[PDB]
């Protein structure tokens, strides 16, 4: 009948517990040892300059008010006990719309070790912001950040720290790559302190370095552009007596280049500078227009 003794243990733990007070409120600064396990790096939306990432966000602090002494060492409790204790309010500094999964039960976990060391993991789907400088499109490389810190707890109260060597904290699953356009190279973690109007906060940062794959842009822009330029220069080997043929060549190649520029600019965000593909398309347009001008002069 271990049910009764374990119920008594739990009721002794929560008897006289105030979940509005961080552990060690008077004489200590709480130390939250975080960790991340990226189950799948979601598709990097280039239009919204965002990216999705599905994580196992782990945290672990030391609560001395949750010490017990029973037959078991670690209490692997239900995810509904985590709402009756104090849990750090980690928010993502750049997350846009994050969801916490509730299928079929709340995807959370809580293991209370016998010496008070808690462990609290969640399964999140963070849609963070990745500002992109598309000046080398489509040969660009980005570093999408993921900054998370505490809300309402300054640096004098709750400090964050990685749980393993900072190089081994953010782990990415092997088969977890929903990236069809980019190519994930590696992560890079860092820890700093941001000032504010309310206080000084500890901020943990994680950059995922990306590298766009040029195959699709090649196939759908550079091949049609080059083929159009070739089809345009074909108009020089025709004899000078056939005027309508060369006129058709010139006009249709100019129209094809125009529609190619239009279809190539639709893929990108509505950006206000010129990309590399833009320069390539401009030069190909110049070449076809020069072919037409040469035919007109002839």
């Amino acid at each position: 009948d271990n049910t009764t003794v374990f119920t008594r243990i739990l009721d002794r733990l929560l008897d006289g517990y105030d979940n509005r007070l961080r552990p060690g409120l008077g004489e200590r600064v709480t130390e939250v040892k975080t960790d991340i396990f990226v189950t799948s790096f979601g598709p990097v939306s280039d239009h919204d300059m965002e990216y999705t990432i599905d994580v196992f966000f782990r945290q672990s602090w030391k609560d001395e008010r949750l010490k017990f002494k029973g037959p078991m060492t670690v209490l692997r409790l239900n995810n509904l006990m985590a709402s009756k204790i104090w849990t750090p309010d980690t928010f993502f500094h750049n997350g846009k719309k994050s969801v916490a999964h509730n299928m079929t039960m709340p995807n959370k976990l809580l293991r209370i070790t016998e010496d008070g060391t808690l462990l609290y993991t969640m399964r999140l789907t963070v849609r963070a912001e990745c500002p992109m400088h598309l000046e080398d499109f489509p040969m660009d490389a980005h570093a999408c950040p993921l900054k998370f810190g505490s809300y309402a707890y300054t640096r004098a109260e709750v400090v964050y720290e990685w749980t393993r060597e900072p190089a081994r904290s953010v782990v990415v699953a092997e088969d977890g790559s929903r990236l069809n356009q980019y190519d994930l190279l590696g992560q890079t973690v860092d820890s700093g302190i941001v000032q504010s109007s309310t206080g000084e906060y500890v901020v943990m940062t994680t950059h995922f370095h990306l590298k766009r794959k040029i195959g699709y842009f090649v196939i759908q822009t550079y091949l049609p552009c080059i083929m159009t330029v070739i089809l345009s220069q074909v108009s020089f080997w025709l004899n000078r007596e056939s005027v309508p043929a060369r006129t058709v060549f010139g006009v249709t190649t100019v129209l094809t280049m125009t529609t190619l520029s239009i279809s190539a600019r639709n893929s990108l965000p509505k950006v206000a500078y010129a990309t590399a593909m833009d320069w390539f398309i401009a030069v190909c347009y110049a070449f076809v227009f020069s072919a037409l001008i040469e035919f007109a002069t002839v």
Partner: antibody
Amino acid sequence: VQLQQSGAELVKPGASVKLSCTASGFNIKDTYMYWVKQRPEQGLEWIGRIDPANGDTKYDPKFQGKATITTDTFSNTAYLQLSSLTSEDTAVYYCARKGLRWAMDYWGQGTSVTVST
Amino acid sequence: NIVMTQSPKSMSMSVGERVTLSCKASEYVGTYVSWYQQKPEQSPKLLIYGASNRYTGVPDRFTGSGSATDFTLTIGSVQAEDLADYHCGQSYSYPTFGAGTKLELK
């Protein structure tokens, strides 16, 4: 808060020495425990670390197999055992705990081992 | 294995002048470079945990300066008891220290 290492050792080449590091002022289950060697008039060198909560120990690639790191949670002690030692590792061995930003804030005092005949 | 090239190898400087030490990391180490001060016949003492964060009990004449790879330790008004080794060690990966700089008085 206060790390007490062992005393100096005078070991013959080809034997095993087990140095102890007793931590007083905290529990070793909270932090890691690094072992560092330093030959005379040279730079510091990492041997290995141990997570006393689990027992996961990592070693420097050039110290794998030669040294082993164990713990004792009841007495809050870390043990470093040099399995097979030559006459070259006559260095000073320090015991340190990880600090706030993964630094080594509290060091030991050094057990200067000596290998000779 | 991340290697830390610390410079210079050994410098000699008089009292009361500003001095600077450099520690260039091979790979990336965000701000996990620590500076330790080892006096002769003693155990190393942590001066700068992380880049540019003095440890409790360190005089304000020690200052760190961090980056991705290059790091700097500047001492201001140098006193007479600052004659010791100064090691820089990263912690972004498994810890690897530098060679150290023998500070001297002349």
